[PDB]
Design a protein around this ligand. Structure first.
Ligand SMILES: C[C@@H](O)CN1CCN(CC(=O)O)CCN(CC(=O)O)CCN(CC(=O)O)CC1
Ligand SMILES: C[C@@H](O)CN1CCN(CC(=O)O)CCN(CC(=O)O)CCN(CC(=O)O)CC1
Ligand SMILES: [Cl-]
Ligand SMILES: [Cl-]
Ligand SMILES: [Cl-]
Ligand SMILES: [Cl-]
Ligand SMILES: [Cl-]
Ligand SMILES: [Cl-]
Ligand SMILES: [Gd]
Ligand code: NA
Length: 129
């Protein structure tokens, strides 16, 4: 599913991601835009043989099982395919674990390079949340 911006913002808010660990909703929407273009089915292979999955491009090295990242962990306790669903619940729940974990939203490279330090409220402007 390719979410619209305000659609995604509403779903993230409903699932408690807004202000989670102090990161306002616009941070999460901006991250999703630049990680996946709002597309739940996005996948991208990393140099190390892991893959990033879903609207927040969550990695199989640590967070989900894809059966093809030998030696990896599955800290979200999910198949990586769960991160591709039209329902973002699994992505949100796993993102909550990631962002609690040490570097906060710097875990998401596109957030660090394209969202951090910017007017992120722009990403929810105009929405009825
Ligand atoms: C901030 C870093 O710690 C992030 N981290 C980088 C890699 N770490 C480095 C280390 O933990 O020294 C090694 C593996 N790490 C072991 C562990 O955490 O117990 C599991 C994955 N972690 C879980 C987490 O950290 O919440 C996510 C990625
Ligand atoms: C193996 C190293 O990770 C040891 N570690 C070195 C420093 N870590 C590095 C990191 O976690 O990336 C940073 C702080 N660390 C965060 C965490 O782990 O959750 C908590 C303390 N850790 C607990 C543990 O790791 O079992 C002991 C020391
Ligand atoms: Cl929308
Ligand atoms: Cl915001
Ligand atoms: Cl694996
Ligand atoms: Cl594990
Ligand atoms: Cl933080
Ligand atoms: Cl990570
Ligand atoms: Gd770690
Ligand atoms: Na894994």
């Amino acid at each position: 599913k390719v979410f619209g911006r305000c659609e995604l913002a509403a779903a993230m808010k409903r699932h408690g991601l807004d202000n989670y660990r102090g990161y306002s909703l616009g941070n999460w929407v901006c991250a999703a835009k630049f990680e996946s273009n709002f597309n739940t089915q996005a996948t991208n292979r990393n140099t190390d043989g892991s893959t990033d999955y879903g609207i927040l491009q969550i990695n199989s090295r640590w967070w989900c099982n894809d059966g093809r990242t030998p030696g990896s962990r599955n800290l979200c306790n999910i198949p990586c395919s769960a991160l591709l669903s039209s329902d973002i619940t699994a992505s949100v729940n796993c993102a909550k674990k990631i962002v609690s974990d040490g570097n906060g939203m710097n875990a998401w490279v596109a957030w660090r390079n394209r969202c951090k330090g910017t007017d992120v409220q722009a990403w929810i402007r105009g929405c009825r949340l």
